């Protein structure tokens, strides 16, 4: 049976915290809906997902990753207007003339990986 899921940066249905000794451990193939706090997302980019009790425990694990923040870059610009970027979401930034991206390009798209940017956005010379 699957024990009480310690959701990180997130929650399960909030009666389960009070009635914990009644509901847990759960039987295999029981499903449980969990959700992230604001500023966090599940690895799929969903705010909410079902985990399932298995012989492996809760699968997928109820882990919420933190959103990447808009970078403090200079000598350049960010095309995307938003401040926070979902996990596995990607964002485009570009150089002023006479500058080149971290990838050496005119413009570069970087992804917020499972934690942190795939590269630090910067427009070098």
């Amino acid at each position: 049976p699957c024990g009480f899921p310690h959701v990180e940066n997130g929650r399960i249905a909030q009666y389960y915290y009070t009635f914990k000794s009644f509901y847990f451990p759960m039987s295999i193939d029981k499903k449980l809906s969990f959700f992230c706090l604001a500023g966090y997302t599940t690895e799929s980019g969903r705010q909410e997902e079902q985990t399932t009790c298995t012989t492996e425990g809760w699968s997928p694990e109820p882990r919420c990753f933190k959103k990447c923040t808009k970078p403090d870059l200079s000598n350049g610009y960010i095309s995307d207007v938003k401040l926070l970027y979902k996990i596995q979401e990607n964002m485009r930034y570009g150089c002023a003339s006479g500058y080149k991206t971290t990838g050496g390009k005119d413009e570069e798209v970087v992804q917020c990986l499972s934690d942190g940017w795939s590269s630090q956005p910067t427009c070098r010379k």
Binding site: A13, Q14, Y15, T18, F19, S21, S33, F35, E48
Partner: protein, 722 residues
């Protein structure tokens, strides 16, 4: 001018507007051959009830000759142009339009884009086939689409403007909620539960008392001719904004508020006066169909309703729009609780019941609806069944319907969430408190009973007429920690216990007392037996009182039909039994409808001063109406229905109305008999021509100036027509 709004509220589905047959745009040259561009000659909706659209949408049951489809699911149409379609230059779209002030951003004007593939969750149309002049579209509606009756148009774009089909009422399309679509907020994940809670048109309503449960059938008839239009008319009379009718929470919240009429502007006038002058007795109605059609035609509140009538009408409304719904009956319902978890009984100093102060009354049963939906306004874990009670009580808004309250919230006492959840929790979880009103004007709490309120909650079982116990869906097993955890959670979120029972303790006398009333037929004598047990080596003496009262099923008393006193000795470690014979001449002249009696047995032990208090209802059994049939039980064939009623009383019944009903078998009908002498039998015969095959039910009822709440039913197999 009118500075409040740029356009009036689009809050009626019956309202329409005149879409231009041509929208010329800009400068149009002289002599433009607009007939280079496509003209639509005919549109086909494949709308026949045996055909793919209505069968796969589960809408073939409706007695309606227009296209009825469920949102979030694709359906076919064919369009015939004046010339073959040329994708390189012929741009066109279907338009769905609803109300008088349709707007695209409000979702009340819907241009359906042509697409190579239908996306999930989007309006669109796929050209699945082309054949000379004709194109066949697979259209898909949004799973969040407004529910209602849409006008359809086809519009072709040109450099010069838009050319559009004229108003064609034959193409008006009903879009309904889709329990079969995984993306719909009303999605129900079990086919048997969809078949029961949406496609079943005959309900069972449970009444009586928890020791003597009674059943009656109820025709929901949500498929009958004009009922869908009547549900739309109900929302139009609510003046519900069309952009809100896509939401099952708001549709439940407004539809339930429409069920009980305060002044005008509601479906049913509530009455419990037992007279029902200038109206129909609530216990006469066989089903929702004639109530709804009377409302639709008279445009005024129908006289009269009660809790099961309101629940029946609202269950028809919900199932007709396609929200999954069921009636549930709670036994010993603490209605009008004001979110207090305490019902007070007042006692005289000698231990008799103080009938002057005891004005709280516990309803032997109460009916409310459950509707199935997700709750995206709440946090996770509160979807599924939502309790809606269309019977008004004082809540935070006022004297109104309560809910939708999440049943999963109620079970855990999480009553901080909307709507009205503390009052529904208090309805199932209140205690009884027995209070001595002393002659010095002080109040002393004598006894507490947590077990009485909401002892059982029942609903019709899936695929049969038996009851299903659902009490454990509303509250945890009694006397366990999780019940206390739920109670404490409810007390955190504004449930109340005005009296601190903290000082109450079990009776150190170790005496115990209980009594039983045997079930009886109306007009028979019956025995009430009181038992005392002394589980101690002390001798005691006890004074005990029986008060027997005739009551409404709401627990409201009318008269104390019997009163008796016992003086009893209990010798050390023993037991003793008193018996009472109750006769027909005591109660028969006085009974109210549903023939309910309520007994208090209360006793004070002289030496220890402890009070023992118990109370029990019972409902007298009234003989059933008998239905019989003759002839070919075949669709479109004549069949003869015989309704038989035998007057059970010692008296002549007067102004006897008999009602007959049965969805797909007969329209609602009624017959008047001037008098039925005791114990004579009336018969009524009708010839009826059934139009729905399979298992069907005939339902009958009786009402009169002195007897009512008498029912009967018969299952009939109707064969398919040749």
């Amino acid at each position: 001018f009118g500075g409040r709004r740029a356009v009036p509220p689009n809050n009626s589905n019956a309202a329409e507007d005149d879409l231009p047959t041509v929208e010329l745009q800009g400068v149009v040259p002289r002599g433009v051959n607009l007939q280079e561009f496509l003209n639509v000659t005919s549109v086909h909706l494949f709308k026949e009830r045996w055909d793919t659209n209505k069968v796969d949408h589960h809408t073939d049951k409706y007695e309606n000759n227009k296209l009825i489809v469920r949102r979030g699911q694709s359906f076919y149409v064919q369009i015939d142009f004046s010339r073959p379609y040329d994708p390189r230059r012929d741009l066109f779209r279907v338009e769905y339009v609803i109300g008088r002030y349709p707007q695209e951003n409000k979702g009340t004007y819907i241009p359906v884009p042509i697409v190579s593939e239908l996306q999930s969750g989007k309006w669109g149309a796929k050209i699945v086939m082309r054949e000379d002049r004709s194109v066949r579209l697979s259209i898909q509606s949004s799973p969040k689409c407004i529910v209602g009756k849409f006008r359809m148009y086809v519009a072709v774009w040109t450099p010069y403007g838009v050319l559009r089909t004229s108003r064609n009422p034959e193409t008006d399309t009903y879009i309904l909620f889709n329990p079969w679509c995984e993306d719909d907020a009303v999605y129900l994940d079990n086919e048997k539960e969809r078949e029961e809670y949406v496609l079943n048109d005959i309900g069972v309503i449970f009444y009586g008392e928890v020791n003597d449960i009674k059943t009656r059938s109820w025709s929901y008839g949500q498929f009958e001719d004009g009922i869908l239009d009547t549900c739309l008319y109900v929302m139009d009379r609510a003046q519900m904004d069309l952009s809100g009718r896509g939401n099952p929470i708001k549709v439940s919240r407004v539809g339930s508020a429409m069920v009980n009429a305060k002044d005008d502007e509601g479906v049913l006038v509530g009455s419990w006066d037992n007279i029902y002058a200038y109206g129909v007795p609530p216990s006469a109605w066989t089903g929702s169909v004639d109530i709804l059609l009377e409302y639709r035609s008279s445009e005024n509140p129908v006289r009269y309703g009660q809790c099961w009538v309101f629940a029946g009408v609202f269950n028809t409304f919900l199932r007709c729009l396609g929200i999954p719904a069921r009636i549930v009956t709670n036994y010993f319902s603490a209605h009008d609780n004001d979110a207090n978890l305490q019902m007070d009984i007042f006692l005289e100093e000698d231990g008799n019941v103080n009938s002057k102060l005891t004005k709280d009354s516990v309803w032997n049963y109460h009916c409310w609806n459950e509707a199935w939906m997700t709750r995206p306004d709440l946090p996770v874990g509160f979807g599924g069944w939502q309790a809606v009670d269309s019977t008004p009580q004082e809540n935070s808004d006022g004297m109104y319907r309560c809910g939708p309250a999440s049943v999963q919230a109620i079970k855990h006492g999480h009553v901080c969430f909307q709507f009205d959840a503390p009052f529904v929790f208090a309805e199932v979880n209140s205690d009884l408190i027995y209070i001595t009103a002393k002659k010095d004007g002080t109040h002393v709490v004598e006894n507490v009973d947590a077990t009485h309120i909401g002892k059982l909650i029942v609903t019709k079982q899936i695929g049969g007429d038996g009851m299903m116990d659902i009490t454990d869906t509303y509250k945890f097993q009694e006397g366990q920690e999780e019940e206390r955890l739920a109670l404490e959670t409810a007390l955190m979120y504004g449930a109340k216990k005005p009296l601190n029972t903290e000082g109450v303790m079990k009776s150190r006398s170790n005496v115990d007392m209980d009594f039983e009333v045997e079930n009886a037929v109306l007009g028979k004598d019956f025995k009430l037996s009181i038992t005392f047990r002394n589980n101690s080596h002390n001798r005691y003496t006890i004074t005990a009182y029986l008060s027997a009262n005739i009551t409404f099923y709401t627990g409201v008393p009318k008269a104390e039909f019997k009163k008796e006193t016992f003086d009893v000795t209990l010798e050390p470690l023993s037991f003793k039994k008193e018996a009472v014979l109750i006769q027909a001449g005591e109660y028969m002249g006085q009974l109210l409808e549903q023939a309910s009696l309520h007994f208090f047995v209360t006793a004070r032990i002289n030496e220890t001063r402890d009070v023992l208090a118990k109370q029990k209802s019972t409902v007298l059994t009234i003989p059933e109406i008998i239905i019989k049939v003759r002839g070919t039980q075949v669709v479109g064939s004549d069949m003869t229905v015989t309704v038989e009623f035998t007057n059970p009383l010692k008296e002549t019944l007067r102004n006897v109305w008999v009602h007959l009903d049965g969805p797909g078998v007969t329209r609602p009908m009624k017959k008047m008999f001037r008098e039925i002498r005791p114990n004579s039998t009336v018969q009524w015969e009708e010839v009826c021509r059934p139009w729905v095959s399979g298992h069907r039910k005939l339902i009958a009822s009786m009402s009169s100036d002195s007897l009512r709440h008498v029912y009967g039913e018969l299952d009939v197999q109707i064969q398919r027509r040749p």
